[PDB]
Copies of this chain bind each other. A is one copy, B any other.
Amino acid sequence: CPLMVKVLDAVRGSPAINVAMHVFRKAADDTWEPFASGKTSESGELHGLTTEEEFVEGIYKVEIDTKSYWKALGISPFHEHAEVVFTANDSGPRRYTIAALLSPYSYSTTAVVTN
């Protein structure tokens, strides 16, 4: 699993469950081609988005539907979505975890890139 996403909820102190997201890959014409998508599990995680073979170098965008998450909780959110845009680069075997910690008016995001 070369690319995984983890989402946590800073209001409830829990995994953010059933958070939908779409992953896009930047095309030569600078448009965002849909690449993969899913919803987070009960652990706030989304696995199995891509494979080693297809996860080639390039610019990728993860668009996390945080607005729908907060709306389902009855809490007014600020952002339309949380977007994480990064370049994936071949420097040895790399596994990427994109993590986001969500609050209604704020979010934090980090990457855990390992071998």
Contact with B along A1-37 (1 / 0, CB 8 A): 0000000111111110000000000000000000000
SS class, residues of chain A in contact with chain B: strand
Copies in the complex: 4
Q: How far is the CB of A65 from chain B (nearest CB, A)?
A: 11
B106-A110 in contact (CB<8A): yes
Which residue of chain B has its CB nearest to the CB of A101?
B110
B106-A10 in contact (CB<8A): yes
Q: How far is the CB of A9 from chain B (nearest CB, A)?
A: 8
B13-A113 in contact (CB<8A): yes
Contact with B along A80-103 (1 / 0, CB 8 A): 110111110000000000000101
Q: Can you spell out 23 A-B residue pairs with CB atoms less than 8 angstroms apart?
A: A8-B110, A9-B105, A10-B104, A10-B105, A10-B110, A11-B75, A11-B103, A11-B105, A12-B104, A13-B104, A14-B114, A15-B112, A15-B114, A78-B113, A79-B84, A79-B85, A80-B85, A83-B83, A83-B85, A101-B106, A103-B106, A106-B110, A106-B111
